[PDB]
């Protein structure tokens, strides 16, 4: 069990942690004491029908959602809905390699968690702590979109609306390759010590290298060419890395990243139908708005549009953002307005 | 001076090496004995007017051109033209960090060579060895396209036709960032030893990591999603790396790669006009066919099309290839046919 000031309430914002008990993973592993970290906003109504679930994405928590997406002047209105965000397993806030009390699964002994394991865990938490059996809507970005797809496919009758933003239901081979390069440069750091490091500050070089890898793929060529980072109040291109991206990733836990990266690499909702993705997404009953980002480099529109054509009664709402995938951080002026417009229309139907 | 069987005539094909003497570089450095490696095909006519120059690209030599692009049944016909390919400085075949006899510039002491330095060197070789003062055409890919742009801007009256394939005239900030990640993972290898290694086999891990970085950026999402590597006779996605890309890069010299990577990072033909790219490309007198690859991830059409709109009398001929940038290796069925069609039309006018 390590100490990282980044993974605290003082940084990520207020949140609670409840345990759902023994969780048997699909890959074989077992988490004896599986506890999740969640944050809520708003009041659950009488018949518990205004609940909205928000899964976190890679290298992220609930913080971004509560400080960019959630508000009374937004679609995700805590005045109308009970908005709950549950952190991924091993994401650093929930039960993770570098914070678990269990010695059998501590650090490099932490098991492999699939997206399906998260959704199973989330459903258990929602029932146990709030008695929620149906969700008004499920909204998530990147890996959160993967969990969104898993939710509406695994528990079709438990979700009314879905908003998978910038993410696919079945991971494409290119996504795997890219994610592999992310893991390699981190494992390349000798300070990593095969997952048995004493501090995340020892793997500082590897974390910084991954940061640069995100600068290359997580944005767009036009983002850099037009210097769109200027509206963020940054001086130069190099300042974008050294004063923003690099400090961010260097503050994170390598084991946590590697864990969620694996989860990301094996996202596949077609596991429920023996591989037939068309048959899997055919199960979808929820009203779905597939919302990719226009300039998303590793989650391109064509990939998302292909899946959207398999989801019955769904619509494709492309979000125009020059910042590409990392536009999820709300670094563009017109990003949130587009998000709110589409989500409001989704919440109306 | 090291020994690498990869950088030999037995692998890259037959070639000659001549010295152009003292070469003072723009960055300040000096190469006392500057010798280049070149390969030729065809016969130079009476008035020396059928010469075609082909600069090499990153991590490459003349081999690909002579085994994919050049032939009697191709546009680059050695029956009509004297086709000469001159290897970049420090590319492994020409005077390089790991083959120079000069101790003052050996290995990690090797100076910084710009694209402009290559073109100056190439012009000297062409005059010294063949008395060529004008070129029928200049054709190059990637960094070869950069040298193509430099040629038609620096020596406007010495080039009649130009075919910059999949490359820009002025390096965009995104290209710099991507190239930086390539250099980092190589320098991350402890076996690299700050450029003072005894064998390229010591930096095997870093070279392999760069290979994977190319698999992520050098192709396209559709290339992997449609498994276009099957026509190459490869079994699986993993086989594409382990049995093709990884062995290729692991066979190369780290210092050579780092040198050409720097050169790539500082490609700027607007240096001749104080930064005004529009004014620089305005100097172009040669008939130019800007030919980007449709799915090129880090040399996208929009970037190339922007430059093409500044070159007077030029045309834009986009090459349709799912393989993206690495389509230059002729891994697609319809690649060379497109290349030959456009080049023939260029050679006609």
From Swiss-Prot, chains A, B:
Gene Ontology molecular function, alphabetical: homoserine O-acetyltransferase activity; hydrolase activity
**Mind listing the UniProt keywords for this protein, alphabetically?**
Hydrolase
Task: Enumerate the Gene3D superfamilies for this protein.
Answer: alpha/beta hydrolase (3.40.50.1820)
Q: Looking at the Swiss-Prot or TrEMBL record, what is one Pfam family this protein matches? A: Abhydrolase_1
What biological-process terms (Gene Ontology) are attached? biosynthetic process
Tell me which residues make up the AB hydrolase-1 domain. Answer: 60-329
Instruction: Specify the enzyme's EC class, one word.
Output: hydrolase
Q: What does this protein do?
A: Esterase that catalyzes the hydrolysis of 4-nitrophenyl acetate in vitro.
Let me see what the UniProt entry remarks about domains.
The 3D structure excludes the ability of the enzyme to bind homoserine and acetyl-CoA, indicating that it cannot function as a homoserine acetyltransferase.
Describe the subunit structure.
Homodimer.
Q: What is this protein called?
A: Probable esterase Cgl0839
């Amino acid at each position: 069990m390590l100490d990282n000031s980044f993974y605290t309430a003082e940084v990520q914002g207020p949140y609670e942690t409840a345990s759902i008990g023994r969780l048997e993973l699909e890959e074989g592993g077992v988490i004896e004491d599986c506890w999740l970290a969640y944050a809520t906003a708003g009041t659950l109504n009488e018949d518990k029908s205004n609940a909205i679930l928000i899964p976190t994405w890679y290298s992220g928590t609930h913080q971004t959602w509560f400080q960019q997406y959630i508000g009374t002047d937004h679609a995700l209105d805590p005045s109308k809905y009970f908005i709950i965000s549950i952190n991924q397993i091993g994401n650093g806030l929930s039960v993770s390699p570098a914070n678990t009390a269990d010695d059998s699964i501590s650090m490099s002994k932490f098991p492999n968690v699939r997206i399906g394991d998260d959704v199973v865990a989330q459903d258990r938490l929602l029932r146990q702590e709030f008695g929620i059996t149906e969700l008004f809507a499920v909204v998530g970005g990147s890996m959160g979109a993967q969990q969104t797809y898993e939710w509406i496919v695994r528990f079709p009758d438990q979700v009314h609306r879905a908003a998978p933003i910038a993410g696919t239901a079945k991971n494409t081979p290119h996504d795997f390759i890219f994610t592999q390069t992310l893991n390699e440069t981190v494992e390349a750091d000798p300070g990593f010590n095969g997952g048995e490091y004493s501090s995340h500050e020892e793997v500082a070089d590897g974390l910084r290298r991954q940061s640069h890898l995100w600068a290359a793929m997580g944005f767009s060529t036009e983002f850099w060419k037009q210097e769109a980072w200027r509206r963020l109040g940054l001086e130069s291109k190099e300042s974008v890395l050294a004063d923003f991206l690099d400090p961010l990733f260097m503050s994170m836990d390598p084991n946590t990243l590697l864990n969620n990266a694996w989860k990301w690499q094996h996202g596949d909702v077609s596991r429920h139908t023996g591989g037939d993705l068309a048959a899997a997404l055919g199960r979808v009953k929820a009203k779905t708005f597939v919302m990719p980002i226009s300039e998303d480099m590793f989650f391109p529109v064509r990939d998302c549009a292909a899946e959207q054509a398999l989801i019955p009664g769904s619509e494709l709402r492309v979000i125009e953002d020059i910042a590409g995938h990392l536009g999820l951080f709300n670094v563009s002026e017109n990003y949130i307005p587009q998000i709110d417009k589409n989500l409001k229309e989704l919440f109306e139907s």
